[PDB]
Design a protein around this nucleic acid. Sequence first.
RNA 1: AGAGAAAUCAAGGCAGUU
RNA 2: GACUGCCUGUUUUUGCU
Lengths: 245, 620, 710
Amino acid sequence: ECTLRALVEEYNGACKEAPKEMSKQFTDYNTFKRYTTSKKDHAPQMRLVYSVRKPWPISMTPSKEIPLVFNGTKLKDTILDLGESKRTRANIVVPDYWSKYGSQTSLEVVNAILYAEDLKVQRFFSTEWGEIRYGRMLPFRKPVQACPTIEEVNPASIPHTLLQVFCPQYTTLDSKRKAHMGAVEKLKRVMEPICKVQTQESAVHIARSLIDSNKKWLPTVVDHTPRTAEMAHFLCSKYHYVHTN
Amino acid sequence: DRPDHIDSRVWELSETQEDWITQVHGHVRRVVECWKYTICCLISNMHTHRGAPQYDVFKWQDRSTIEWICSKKKVQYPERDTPDLYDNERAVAYKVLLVSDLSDHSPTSGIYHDLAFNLEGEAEESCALVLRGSQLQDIKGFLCRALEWVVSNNLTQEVVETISGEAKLQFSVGTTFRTLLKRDTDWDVIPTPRVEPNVPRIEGRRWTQMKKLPLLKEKEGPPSPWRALLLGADSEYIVCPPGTDQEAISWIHSQSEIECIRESKSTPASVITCLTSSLQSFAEGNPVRSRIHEDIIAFGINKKQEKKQSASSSASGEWKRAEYQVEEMSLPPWVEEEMVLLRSDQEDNWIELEKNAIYTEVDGVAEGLVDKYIEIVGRTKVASVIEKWQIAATRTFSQLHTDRSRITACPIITRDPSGNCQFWGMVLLGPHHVKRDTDNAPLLIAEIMGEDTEEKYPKHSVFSLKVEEKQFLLSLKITSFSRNKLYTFSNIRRVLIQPASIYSQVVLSRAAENNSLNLEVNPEIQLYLEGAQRGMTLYQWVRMILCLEFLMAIYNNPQMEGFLANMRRLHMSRHAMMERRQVFLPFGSRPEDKVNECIINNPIVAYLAKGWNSMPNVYY
Amino acid sequence: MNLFTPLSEINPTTTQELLYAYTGPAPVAYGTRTRAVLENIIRPYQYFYKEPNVQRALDIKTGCKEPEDINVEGPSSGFHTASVLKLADNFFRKYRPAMEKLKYWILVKLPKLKYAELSKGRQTYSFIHKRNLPAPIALEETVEFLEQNLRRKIGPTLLSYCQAIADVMELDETTYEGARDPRPWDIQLEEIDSDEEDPLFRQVGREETYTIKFSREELWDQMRTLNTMWKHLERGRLNRRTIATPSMLIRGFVKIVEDAAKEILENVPTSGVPVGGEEKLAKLASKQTFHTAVTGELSGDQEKFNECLDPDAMRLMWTVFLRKLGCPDWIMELFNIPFMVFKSKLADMGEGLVYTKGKLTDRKPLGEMPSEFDDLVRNVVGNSISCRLGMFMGMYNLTSTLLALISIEREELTGSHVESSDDFIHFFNCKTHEEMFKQAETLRLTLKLVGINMSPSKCILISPAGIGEFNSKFHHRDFVGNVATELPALVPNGTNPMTDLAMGLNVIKHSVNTGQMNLCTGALAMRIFNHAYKYAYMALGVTRRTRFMEENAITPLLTNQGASPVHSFSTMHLDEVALRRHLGLLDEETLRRILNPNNPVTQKGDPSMFFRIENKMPQIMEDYSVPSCFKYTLSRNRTIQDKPHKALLNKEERYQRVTSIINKLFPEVLIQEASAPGTVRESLKRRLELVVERSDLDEERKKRILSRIF
RNA sequence: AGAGAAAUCAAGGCAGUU
RNA sequence: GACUGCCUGUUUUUGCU
Ligand SMILES: Nc1nc2c(ncn2[C@@H]2O[C@H](COP(=O)(O)CP(=O)(O)OP(=O)(O)O)[C@@H](O)[C@H]2O)c(=O)[nH]1
């Protein structure tokens, strides 16, 4: 396979160009995965308007599918971005150009990246709402599971359950025990199209979304089921309550 | 620091297997683990079975490769009791257990058959049977070297302690760091004060009841001039023929005459040429023009250098500390008339917000309340001023390249439902290189006026504008405005939310008590107007609320923030007294002193303070 | 203001929303912070004695004072040692489950805390660059400093990092030997990965080596040094405050104590500092079992909180707690280092007091010429000044709340108390008004015992309970929402249109869920946010994006593209893309094209993102928006050029390459933390061998693949 | 000038030349 | 001095808990 050859070449290049960073500790990955000089979470609201209007306002990794000039408009720069090794700048309309003239993925990948959201939308659009009744309702807060999950799993065994979904060959027998066998095959069958080494940084997030139960304080009148809690913002209030069936 | 018998390779491999430094006798434990790993290596020195080596070292190896090997060998081991090495010629896994007794066989685990040595070199009889002699002599030599190193350093108690039990966590503060620590405290690291724990009885003070609400200080001085960026209620538009911005500006520039009715020394009358040049350039098509000689005065080009040079030229001889005075000002008369004209009914809705989707009966109810609220507060002058402020701020902050060296024109043009353009004015962004949030971008705002005062607009320069047998007054002020304020005024339409919340609460509470929504409730609400109690309809009230919130927003400053923050306590105390409740205060309690320290010159703060000092102060 | 006070229909408490001006500009601080820092450091030295005497109060090391010395009619700085000891014991005797959980945290979770958790913070003062740097960079340089002056490898745990810090100060002299660009004004370009028509260049920068010499005293000062700054965009005060950041050499020590304090506080029923421990006060308000009793309600604030507190009293309270649980002495020697470094604290001054000569002004240090802070000149160390008494910043809010809570625990005080740093609320339930007055005065005096110092003009007691205030939440028979607090957060963020839309809907939904918004307010906020969203992302009127869509015939199919809104008040939890797919707005082709994994513009992220409104307490927000082509990030800021320390960019790109070779070979570092013992090179080599050997290929192919690895 | 409020902005650096 | 070009608009000592 050429993938192994590419991995070996990338390892050799990283060894050559960064001798010191390769002499670090593997446990330091938890701290240099975030090593950047950028300050983008520092008051981002107050810079948006003139940042998307600045020349070369967007960050876009070099590729051959984006022409330099399309219909007289320069879409991308020929200079790698500052502080970036595999990332350069482009024009703000590059997303718009890609939305029509870009490459296409498979129909199965779309149903995988949009799985949890699709279940949320179908859950919302498969309920016969009752009639709104008005009154001096008393909403009280109580820790309730936010959104429905595919299967009930202890929050302490979620990492050990996802490890059997993505990398079952890189785990011990203890993690094999402390995993919810029953939630691993469903996640595998719904995430196989994106279990590749390119969408594995996005599949873990959504797969965790299907399986993680986060207790959150939500207003209620009657006790929430886990399905009537993601929609509590409009089913209950201090003046109205609609009774779902 | 490495022992001589311990190889460099095993030492480097051991360096990070366990956290030696925070363990009791960590170096000794590292040396013992190196002994065990070296013993395991000597057991598997070039000895092979079939085609692969007879023993596979499972100690100090990556866990994933160990799992791979175990899968090849059809075995599985727990991580916290994993074997040390595996023998493929006898299908058993082994572990090194250097011990002292050599008599306590005591099989540690039934998963791996354990190998124990007496630390003198001899092997427990089972291990002696199950291993070949050359390995035994190799371990004999390695251990005699280990113990000569031990006796050379007097570590026998440490090594027996390590081979006895597991590691113990610890933390160590050195003698030198302790002395540095104790330089500024009378106690040591672990405080042991020689006093008997008790709670003393101290005599305090009495708590006084607030019989009457505090009276805020009405400050005295010259009335506060209007200091907002735009003109507020005294702002009008010119109904231009329908078209685009360029066509409207061309019409305005061609069909106009400019004459000075009132010139202020703050903004000279020679900066009108800048506005005319900008209008001509924007009409020609290019919204950005070069610099003219009148721009140096209208935008403060090289102002810093000339002021610095003048300050250097004229200087005192003491170098005293810097004292800054904030001039005291009284409530100007224009606040009430501003609040009145901002409530004037208009002909069209000035709040045009795209509706959201509707999917549920709840959704339609939510969009009915908002629709009715926009119907209430959209056909009102305050809505017009909010709209003009939003277009002005957005067109100045979006054209704020934030790094530019030429003058940019940003007309304030809106469209009526009939399509006719409405020219409210034009902001002129000048040479700006703002980086810090305190930096000010030069501005030159031309605005259509409704009435000149000379008491409310002292710095503005009023001009007469003649467009098609109609008379308009054009103000022209030189201002500097910061990026943060341009940002927060581009989202000025958020001021419509606080007035909306009050209306929403009233309507929804009436629906809750009536068990049904109406959407056409016009309740009477009692307020202390002109000092007396009168009942008003909540459609004028939300309008008053909206105008007051708009005036507060455009006049927000540290004085307003402090006044509002320290005044909520007094408002809550009034609410408590209205319910026939008693309010008590601590000894040195003067809650009005934190409100009175923020009343300096802000006109809206003075208006609110006067409104408070027109209310009942005792609730019998 | 008579318009904001209704007399019918709705209560004046319901109009507390109108007493906020949050849609206007937020106060911003101008100029030097040195005066506000010197006036923050001198206040603890002015409240120690009942009569102000700074000169005598400058010799106090431990702020212990006698009961008759406490100023009962003013702010009192200091504590009473015997009272602290007794109150820390009374707080231990009650709330014993909390102490058991603290012991559990000490013996289990404390040993398993990693020092990589110091990289999840924000701007940290660097003792090497003498500037504020992001937490990952400061942590990396501190570990590299400690791994070369100690000549050993620091363990992954926080205890290893603390031990390394405690061991590096034993050395007389230390070195750094860092890297910098000699000539940052010479940007050279080379051709990388492209020689085919469309070239791709990068910026190459030189990297020379420079060394900094620290003696023991200079390194000690850098450990004590607190970089100060203005607190911009603070709302609700007339005067501007200063805030400071501790160095990375003390942050681990601080984090241990703060995590233990959090473990205590999330189990004591009298603490409101934890975010989930705020809804308990709703129950305390709903507690109406009063019957013919004189039940008052006191709501107030503490004056000079970070100025009247002494680190020694807090240290003593922690020592009492640990010694009464039963703990090894190194536990009590680990929980006390933070407070003994923050007793020798060296706060950083500004650039100099403003002295004027006529019209021109010059920035000059404290020592030069007299001023109003001439008493503190003896505490000046370089451009920094020492301050034994006082905290000077709210770095310990958790343990300060703990001190207040141990002060609460007495016998005659039989009321309900909720404490959160400076702001608090207390409920009295007595038999007569005089007993309630005694309890209130006893509460005041007990807070003054340890130096909590209730503000006289900010605490208001209502004799019939029912009206109060706690952290901008007003109470009248129930807690009503306050929509005005959320208004500063309804502006779209600055990350990308998808994340901006998701976070805007999440904020509005959270506001609705807390009762701060309702049907009409939520829908109007959504409409306003949608208009701002469309304007801010080049989707209104004639703009470059709309133009490029016009000539190129690209129809708008997203809200950020100018399409009609799809989200509604019911559909706030839903994603834009899935909602549009379900209703038929994104048929199949654009969806297969914008969600393509090969998008060159999309950037991977985290469903949890930073969310601060305006210099308030940072929060966390969920971002479930799918990684479409519209989930991008802005261009990198280029101010770092023309600076000597631009070599951090080369280190950052090298670390990005090392992170890219990882996350491909190790797919288990996305689910849990990295725990493999060893270097990066060895682990990567072993995983290469493991993946190639486990793969199904010819053995000759396999060994040929292995041969290239080097 | 102005913005503004307890002190700042009203461009700042670097290279070469001079 | 200024005077020829280059660079920067959050990274300049300045958004912490
Ligand atoms: N570290 C931080 N602490 C904060 C922040 N905001 C508030 N606080 C803390 O809250 C408290 C604020 O109270 P102050 O000490 O300013 C006393 P008071 O509120 O009475 O103000 P004055 O009357 O002006 O002294 C104090 O402990 C601060 O450290 C913040 O952003 N960071």
